[PDB]
Amino acid sequence: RAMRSTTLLALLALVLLYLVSGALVFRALEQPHEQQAQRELGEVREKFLRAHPCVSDQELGLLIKEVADALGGGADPETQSTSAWDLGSAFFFSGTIITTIGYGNVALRTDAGRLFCIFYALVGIPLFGILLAGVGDRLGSSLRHGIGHIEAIFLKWHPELVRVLSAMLFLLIGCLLFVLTPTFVFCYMEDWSKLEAIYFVIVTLTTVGFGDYVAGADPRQDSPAYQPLVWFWILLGLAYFASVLTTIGNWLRVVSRRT
Amino acid sequence: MRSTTLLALLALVLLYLVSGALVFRALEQPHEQQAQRELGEVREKFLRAHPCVSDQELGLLIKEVADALGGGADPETQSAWDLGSAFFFSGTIITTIGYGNVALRTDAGRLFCIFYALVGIPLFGILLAGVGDRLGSSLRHGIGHIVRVLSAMLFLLIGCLLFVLTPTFVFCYMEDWSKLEAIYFVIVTLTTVGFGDYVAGADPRQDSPAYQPLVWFWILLGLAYFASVLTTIGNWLRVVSRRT
Ligand SMILES: [K+]
Ligand SMILES: [K+]
Ligand SMILES: [K+]
Ligand SMILES: [K+]
Ligand SMILES: [K+]
Shortest alpha-carbon distance between residue B74 and chain A (Å): 9
Between the alpha carbon of residue B37 and those of residues A68, A81, A183, B68, B78, the distances in Å are 17, 26, 35, 9, 10
User: How far is Cα A187 from Cα A47, in angstroms, rounded to an integer?
Assistant: 37
**Contact state of B117 with A60 under an 8 Å Cβ cutoff:** no
> A210 with B192: CB under 8 angstroms?
no
B111 Cβ neighbours under 8 A, 6+ residues apart: A195, A199
**Contact state of A114 with B194 under an 8 Å Cβ cutoff:** no
B208 Cβ neighbours under 8 A, 6+ residues apart: none
User: How far is Cα B6 from Cα B24, in angstroms, rounded to an integer?
Assistant: 26
**Contact state of A107 with B197 under an 8 Å Cβ cutoff:** yes
Read out DSSP for chain A? ----HHHHHHHHHHHHHHHHHHHHHHHHHHTTT---HHHHHHHHHGGGTSS---S-SHHHHHHHHHHHHHHHTT---SS------SHHHHHHHHHHHHTS----SS---SHHHHHHHHHHHHHHHHHHHHHHHHHHHHHHHHHHHHTHHHHHHHTTT---HHHHHHHHHHHHHHHIIIIIHHHHHHHHHH---HHHHHHHHHHHHTT---SS--TT--TT---STHHHHHHHHHHHHHHHHHHHHHHHHHHTTTTTTT-
**Contact state of A104 with B196 under an 8 Å Cβ cutoff:** yes
Between the alpha carbon of residue B5 and those of residues B18, B188, B223, the distances in Å are 20, 31, 20
Of A231, A104, A245, nearest in space to B193 by CA = A104
A196 Cβ neighbours under 8 A, 6+ residues apart: A186, A187, A213, B110
- Say which amino acid occupies B80: A
Burial of B59: CB neighbours in 10 Å, binned 0-12, 13-18, 19+: middle
Residue B195 assigned ligand-binding role = yes
Partner-chain residue, chosen from A61, A68, A69, that has the shortest CB–CB distance to B78: A61
**Which residues of chain B form beta strands (DSSP E)?**
none
Of B93, B39, B47, nearest in space to B70 by CA = B39
A191 Cβ neighbours under 8 A, 6+ residues apart: none
- For B55, which DSSP code? S
Between the alpha carbon of residue A38 and those of residues A70, A73, A87, A215, B67, the distances in Å are 8, 8, 20, 19, 17
Of A248, A235, A177, A198, nearest in space to B114 by CA = A198
A135 Cβ neighbours under 8 A, 6+ residues apart: A8, A12, A235, A236, A239, A240
Half-sphere exposure of A25 (CA within 13 A, CB side): 18
A195 Cβ neighbours under 8 A, 6+ residues apart: B107, B110, B111
- Say which amino acid occupies B152: A
Burial of B164: CB neighbours in 10 Å, binned 0-12, 13-18, 19+: middle
CA dihedral of B94, B108, B103, B119, whole degrees rounded to 10? -10
User: How far is Cα A147 from Cα B12, in angstroms, rounded to an integer?
Assistant: 40
- Say which amino acid occupies B18: V
Of A129, A121, A30, nearest in space to B195 by CA = A121
User: How far is Cα A241 from Cα B75, in angstroms, rounded to an integer?
Assistant: 40
Nearest residue in A to B96, CA atom? A208
- For B162, which DSSP code? I
**Contact state of B107 with A195 under an 8 Å Cβ cutoff:** yes
- For B144, which DSSP code? T
CA dihedral of A117, A235, A23, A9, whole degrees rounded to 10? -110
Which of the residues B107, B119, B193 would you substitute to probe the A interface, choosing the one with the greatest number of A C-beta atoms within 10 Å?
B193
> A208 with B114: CB under 8 angstroms?
no
Of B107, B27, B103, nearest in space to A195 by CA = B107
Nearest residue in A to B97, CA atom? A208
Shortest alpha-carbon distance between residue B194 and chain A (Å): 6
- Say which amino acid occupies B119: V
Between the alpha carbon of residue B9 and those of residues B19, B44, B50, the distances in Å are 13, 50, 59
Please provide the size of chain A in residues. Answer: 259
User: How far is Cα B51 from Cα B29, in angstroms, rounded to an integer?
Assistant: 33
> A186 with B171: CB under 8 angstroms?
no
Please provide the size of chain B in residues. Answer: 244
B183 alpha carbon to ligand 1 midpoint, in Å?
A: 17
- Say which amino acid occupies A79: T
SS (H, E, C) A224-254: CCHHHHHHHHHHHHHHHHHHHHHHHHHHCCC
Between the alpha carbon of residue A65 and those of residues A58, B31, B39, B47, B184, the distances in Å are 12, 20, 12, 15, 27
B92 Cβ neighbours under 8 A, 6+ residues apart: B98, B99, B194
Shortest alpha-carbon distance between residue B31 and chain A (Å): 17
Partner-chain residue, chosen from B69, B96, B111, that has the shortest CB–CB distance to A71: B69
Which of the residues B113, B195, B198, B232 would you substitute to probe the A interface, choosing the one with the greatest number of A C-beta atoms within 10 Å?
B195
In Å, the largest CA–CA distance within chain A is 85
Helix, strand or coil for residue B192? coil
Q: Nearest ligand to the C-alpha of residue B196?
A: 4
Helices (H), B176-211: 179-190
Of B180, B218, B214, B215, nearest in space to A108 by CA = B180
User: How far is Cα B81 from Cα B110, in angstroms, rounded to an integer?
Assistant: 15
User: How far is Cα B118 from Cα B17, in angstroms, rounded to an integer?
Assistant: 14
Chain B residues with CB under 8 Å of A79 CB are: 59, 63
Cβ neighbours, 10 Å, residue A96: 23
> B162 with B222: CB under 8 angstroms?
no
B193 alpha carbon to ligand 3 midpoint, in Å?
A: 5
Cβ neighbours, 10 Å, residue B204: 7
A136 alpha carbon to ligand 1 midpoint, in Å?
A: 21
A102 alpha carbon to ligand 3 midpoint, in Å?
A: 4
User: How far is Cα A46 from Cα A145, in angstroms, rounded to an integer?
Assistant: 63
In Å, the largest CA–CA distance within chain B is 80
Partner-chain residue, chosen from A62, A68, A121, that has the shortest CB–CB distance to B191: A121
Partner-chain residue, chosen from A78, A207, A211, that has the shortest CB–CB distance to B66: A78
Q: Nearest ligand to the C-alpha of residue B101?
A: 2
> A183 with A197: CB under 8 angstroms?
yes
> A178 with A241: CB under 8 angstroms?
yes
Nearest-10 crossing angle of helices A226-251, A87-98: 10
A172 alpha carbon to ligand 1 midpoint, in Å?
A: 26
Partner-chain residue, chosen from A48, A96, A199, that has the shortest CB–CB distance to B114: A199
> A33 with A114: CB under 8 angstroms?
no
Helix, strand or coil for residue B216? helix
Helix, strand or coil for residue B85? helix
Chain B residues with CB under 8 Å of A67 CB are: 62, 65-66, 69
> B73 with A75: CB under 8 angstroms?
no
Chain B residues with CB under 8 Å of A96 CB are: 193
User: How far is Cα A183 from Cα B111, in angstroms, rounded to an integer?
Assistant: 14
- For B78, which DSSP code? -
Domains of chain A in sequence order: 1-31+83-156 (1.10.287.70), 32-82 (6.10.140.1050), 157-259 (1.10.287.70)
**Contact state of A202 with B96 under an 8 Å Cβ cutoff:** no
- For B137, which DSSP code? G
Chain B residues with CB under 8 Å of A72 CB are: 69
Nearest residue in B to A249, CA atom? B122
> B59 with B144: CB under 8 angstroms?
no
Chain A residues with CB under 8 Å of B180 CB are: 111, 114-115
A30 alpha carbon to ligand 4 midpoint, in Å?
A: 18
